[PDB]
């Protein structure tokens, strides 16, 4: 099918060349084969930012009409960030079909776009009250919270 052939292409591309320190791996079915509709991913914090040292786990869930539609990208556990909903779902315009999603966007581009969002929040379109309010009212406390979260999710 259209989704599965594109996702097999994306997997082969990712395995050969991907940004350093990221992870993107399909989950498995009971029979040991890959479930290309549900990927376990991880995004590293950028060096020189308060996110440095963290590795932040995310699930990427594809619908059967992918790549007409973007995947849903959900931090697990939910992330403290102004543009991450309490559910963990990421708000980003490239991840909305009727905003900036384009079918040609690759998994590398999605994960690099989420990485960029981490240290560059969009305060025009907040997704959670807590991280947004702290970002606006108390940047010192915001950075303390971010550095603590990065430590919590640092690889051992």
């Amino acid at each position: 099918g259209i989704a599965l052939s594109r996702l097999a292409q994306e997997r082969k591309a990712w395995r050969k060349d991907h940004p350093f320190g990221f992870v993107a791996v399909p989950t498995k079915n009971p029979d040991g084969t890959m479930n290309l509709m549900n990927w376990e991913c991880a995004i590293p914090g950028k060096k020189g930012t308060p996110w440095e040292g963290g590795l932040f786990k995310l699930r990427m869930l594809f619908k059967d009409d992918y790549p007409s539609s973007p995947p849903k990208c959900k931090f697990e556990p939910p992330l403290f960030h102004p543009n991450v909903y309490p559910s963990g779902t990421v708000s980003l315009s490239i991840l909305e079909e009727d905003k900036d999603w384009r079918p040609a966007i690759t998994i590398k581009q999605i994960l690099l776009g989420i990485q960029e969002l981490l240290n560059e929040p969009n305060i025009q379109d907040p997704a959670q009250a807590e991280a947004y309010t702290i970002y606006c009212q108390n940047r010192v406390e915001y950075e303390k919270r971010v550095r603590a979260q990065a430590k919590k999710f640092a690889p051992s």
Binding site: R15, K16, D17, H18, F20, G21, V23, V25, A42, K47
Partner: protein, 78 residues
């Protein structure tokens, strides 16, 4: 398949290419990488698909595929 092509990438953007036997311990690739880059074994750790590569792991055991990427990180030295 007797051999597999692999590349080792670092955060400094380096990319070093290898062609190794599928059933040989990856210790031997790690040792080659250290010789080529002029650094000691205790200074690096190597990951594949987000997991540490043991000296006794082989490409076959790990399910590696032609032209796979392996990541090299600096270890605490420390």
């Amino acid at each position: 398949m007797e051999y597999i092509k692999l590349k080792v990438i670092g955060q400094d953007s380096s990319e070093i290419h290898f062609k190794v036997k599928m059933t040989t311990h990856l210790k031997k690739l790690k040792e080659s990488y250290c010789q080529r880059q002029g650094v000691p074994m205790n200074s690096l750790r190597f990951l594949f698909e987000g997991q540490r590569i043991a000296d006794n792991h082989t490409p076959k055991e790990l399910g590696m595929e032609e032209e796979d990427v392996i990541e090299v990180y600096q270890e605490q030295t420390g």
